[PDB]
Amino acid sequence: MYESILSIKPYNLSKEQITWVNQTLVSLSDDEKLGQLICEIIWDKPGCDPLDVMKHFLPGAVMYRPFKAKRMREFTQRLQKASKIPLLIACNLERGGSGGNGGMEDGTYVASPMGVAATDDESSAEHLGEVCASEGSAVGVNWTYEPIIDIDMNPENPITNVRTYGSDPERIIRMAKAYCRGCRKWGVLTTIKHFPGDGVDYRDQHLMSSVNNLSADEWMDTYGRIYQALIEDGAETLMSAHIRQPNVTRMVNPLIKDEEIMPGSLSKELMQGILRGRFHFNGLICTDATQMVGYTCSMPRHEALPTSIQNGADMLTFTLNPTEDFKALQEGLSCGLLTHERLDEAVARILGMKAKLRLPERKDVVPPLHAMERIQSKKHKKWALEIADESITLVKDKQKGLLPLSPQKTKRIILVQATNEKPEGGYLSEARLFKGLLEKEGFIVHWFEEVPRPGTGYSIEDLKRDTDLFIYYANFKVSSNQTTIRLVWSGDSSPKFVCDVPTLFLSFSNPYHLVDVPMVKTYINAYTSNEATVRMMIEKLMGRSSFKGKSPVDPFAGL
Numbered sequence: 001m002y003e004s005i006l007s008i009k010p011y012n013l014s015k016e017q018i019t020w021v022n023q024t025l026v027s028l029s030d031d032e033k034l035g036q037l038i039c040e041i042i043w044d045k046p047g048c049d050p051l052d053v054m055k056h057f058l059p060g061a062v063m064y065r066p067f068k069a070k071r072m073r074e075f076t077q078r079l080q081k082a083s084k085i086p087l088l089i090a091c092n093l094e095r096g097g098s099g100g101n102g103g104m105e106d107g108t109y110v111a112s113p114m115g116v117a118a119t120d121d122e123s124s125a126e127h128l129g130e131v132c133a134s135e136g137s138a139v140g141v142n143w144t145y146e147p148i149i150d151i152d153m154n155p156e157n158p159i160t161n162v163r164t165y166g167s168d169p170e171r172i173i174r175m176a177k178a179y180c181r182g183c184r185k186w187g188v189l190t191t192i193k194h195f196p197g198d199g200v201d202y203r204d205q206h207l208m209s210s211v212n213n214l215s216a217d218e219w220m221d222t223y224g225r226i227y228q229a230l231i232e233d234g235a236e237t238l239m240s241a242h243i244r245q246p247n248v249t250r251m252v253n254p255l256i257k258d259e260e261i262m263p264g265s266l267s268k269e270l271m272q273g274i275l276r277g278r279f280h281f282n283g284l285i286c287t288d289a290t291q292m293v294g295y296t297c298s299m300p301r302h303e304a305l306p307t308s309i310q311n312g313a314d315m316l317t318f319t320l321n322p323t324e325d326f327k328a329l330q331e332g333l334s335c336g337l338l339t340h341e342r343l344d345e346a347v348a349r350i351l352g353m354k355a356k357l358r359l360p361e362r363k364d365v366v367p368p369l370h371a372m373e374r375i376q377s378k379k380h381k382k383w384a385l386e387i388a389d390e391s392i393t394l395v396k397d398k399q400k401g402l403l404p405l406s407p408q409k410t411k412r413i414i415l416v417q418a419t420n421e422k423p424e425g426g427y428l429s430e431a432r433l434f435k436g437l438l439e440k441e442g443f444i445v446h447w448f449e450e451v452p453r454p455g456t457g458y459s460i461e462d463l464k465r466d467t468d469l470f471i472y473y474a475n476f477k478v479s480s481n482q483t484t485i486r487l488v489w490s491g492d493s494s495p496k497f498v499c500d501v502p503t504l505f506l507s508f509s510n511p512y513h514l515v516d517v518p519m520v521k522t523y524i525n526a527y528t529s530n531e532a533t534v535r536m537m538i539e540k541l542m543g544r545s546s547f548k549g550k551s552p553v554d555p556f557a558g559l
């Protein structure tokens with residue numbers, strides 16, 4: 001059975017592969033089928049054993065948090081050889097081998113997706129995807145939870161922002177298809193997220209069930225257009241997140257009551273009515289992480305877990321208390337919250353992706369050790385430099401004669417770090433590098449914290465005697481469970497003397513900082529805070545490299 005699913009896009013399995021899926025399915029107990037539904041998270045901290053993911057059930061997949069590539073490779077061998085059914089092994093490879101709170105600790109940090117989008121060259125996104133999948137597959141990853149095809153409509157949203165390809169649906173489609181092309185070259189499944197679409201609300205689904213409140217027609221013309229394009233392009237998997245679309249839900253079910261409207265991860269109207277029905281998506285649907293507030297607050301958990309599967313999800317991403325969660329699935333199956341027929345259909349789509357990857361027939365469980373040499377390879381580092389060269393964007397340049405910088409125009413610089421990270425020693429490694437590279441050019445550079453500021457004992461004339469230029473290094477990065485990535489001062493260090501001392505503002509992440517420093521006359525978006533982008537920033541400030549980036553978003557955010 002299931003030939004109508006498994007023989008067509010995005011599965012395209014052969015007769016013999018479908019026979020393996022069916023024979024395997026029939027051989028599984030209900031407990032084993034329920035376990036296939038679960039992806040378990042894995043971390044590398046002493047006292048934590050990866051095989052703990054198998055103490056309470058036999059999972060269908062795992063996801064690696066960021067730890068070292070060599071440990072990931074060892075974990076893959078241990079996990080797979082201990083598993084009767086091969087595992088899907090997922091990773092949040094968002095920005096290359098490393099970067100963005102996902103990936104691996106020591107992979108290549110290429111760029112944020114928005115930095116890639118600023119190049120306006122889809123080859124940049126293809127290269128991004130190649131790095132992610134090339135470095136991931138070397139250590140055993142076969143599933144990247146990317147690309148993000150959210151639209152960065154709302155500039156106050158803290159969980160979209162540089163994780164997106166910006167606010168233009170046509171560019172999102174171009175870039176996401178290219179990212180997927182790069183991944184398929186290395187045998188890694190992709191995941192379009194976050195369905196039904198982040199970026200309309202200004203709130204984080206990590207902390208609540210956020211709401212895409214476009215009209216049904218508006219949603220269909222934007223998010224629906226993007227999802228349809230990636231589905232037709234062959235997207236293998238899709239992540240249903242803890243976001244509501246009430247107006248689309250009511251289009252499917254006009255009589256639904258407000259309290260019955262569920263987020264994507266729990267919604268039959270969105271997963272079965274829209275995705276399976278209207279869009280004929282035939283790939284694997286997984287939930288976003290189930291311990292997040294957007295999920296937990298929407299429904300009692302014991303009902304929610306089987307209901308997600310019944311309503312169209314094939315896989316639950318992560319457990320809270322694993323004994324309790326598995327018991328909830330067992331009881332949901334026995335009492336009819338989850339049907340045996342829907343259980344078999346979910347597991348068929350899980351096993352089908354394992355057969356698509358040819359995991360059952362793989363003699364070795366990881367590639368040869370030789371494959372590890374791709375990680376931080378010269379090719380990958382080179383692509384990161386090219387993308388930085390093409391991405392950095394001169395947004396506002398209303399300071400006559402400021403650029404290019406020269407020690408003979410502005411010898412003494414005060415460097416002002418602004419960030420929501422908490423690096424040991426107070427200063428970001430990348431800002432230290434930037435400071436050192438300015439000094440190499442011949443500038444004298446002090447941190448804001450090292451020199452006096454105007455006050456009862458120090459005047460603005462003193463400041464002007466001691467300071468020729470202020471430079472701001474702003475890195476307000478996305479991170480789960482933040483309600484803002486707005487500029488926060490750590491407010492005397494803000495650009496409060498722009499008419500008395502020339503001030504230059506550099507953002508290495510959030511592209512909307514003109515919201516909080518509108519007085520600034522020269523403003524540059526770099527989208528990514530890594531070594532490659534810092535070095536290329538220096539080249540461009542000194543006038544040895546042109547500014548080539550094009551804003552993939554409106555950096556002024558409506559003035």
Ligand SMILES: *[C@H]1O[C@H](CO)[C@@H](O)[C@H](O)[C@H]1F
Nearest residue numbers: 092145194241288289317
């Ligand atoms: C929910 O969690 C999953 C697994 O880490 C991420 O891929 C999604 O971006 C997040 F929304």
